[PDB]
Write a protein that binds this ligand. Sequence first.
Ligand SMILES: O=C(O)/C(O)=C/C(=O)[C@]1(Cc2ccc(Cl)cc2)CCCN(Cc2ccccc2)C1
Ligand SMILES: [Mn+2]
Ligand SMILES: [Mn+2]
Length: 187
Amino acid sequence: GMAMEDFVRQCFNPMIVELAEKAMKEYGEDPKIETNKFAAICTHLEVCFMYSDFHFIDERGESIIVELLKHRFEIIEGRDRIMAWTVVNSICNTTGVEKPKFLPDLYDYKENRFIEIGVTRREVHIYYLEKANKKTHIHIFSFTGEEMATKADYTLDEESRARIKTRLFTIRQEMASRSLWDSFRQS
Ligand SMILES: O=C(O)/C(O)=C/C(=O)[C@]1(Cc2ccc(Cl)cc2)CCCN(Cc2ccccc2)C1
Ligand SMILES: [Mn+2]
Ligand SMILES: [Mn+2]
């Protein structure tokens, strides 16, 4: 468990890591005990913030990709649950979008929809099917470079996607090198 905890701290931005720890405390989990759930939660948060990088909205509400500006996505994952619902209710109140039944990860201010972001150590259709069988847009990434999305609408451009698929693939190599991956996958 020490090796993974060390890996996590070296692998993710300290901000991500500080959020993961609070997230686990909320869930009643201890990051030093459930070190795998700790990596998973850091990975997921990272993909959420990556998904949002570089994306903005201009003065007419046109979306724009850019290497101070209105963010295109509200990031919902990461906040505590009551805070999270507060933001969600208010988006719905400002925009007439119907309230989702489960908390999503993001809200798209251009497309006006919530997004659920999945990251799976498994194969992606199996995951897609569990989550889908449960108007919130779904987008799934794998550690092995695959992805899939509700209606084949991947929202972002291709570069932003390859960026995330690459990061996930790298995280895997690095774990496998440190012989940490089998345990991560098997859980
Ligand atoms: O699997 C996901 O892609 C995903 O986004 C899951 C979630 O958002 C929840 C938190 C969580 C996020 C990520 C992981 Cl790997 C595990 C648990 C777990 C299930 C619902 N939960 C709501 C909640 C928030 C705060 C406290 C309690 C419950 C939020
Ligand atoms: Mn979430
Ligand atoms: Mn998610």
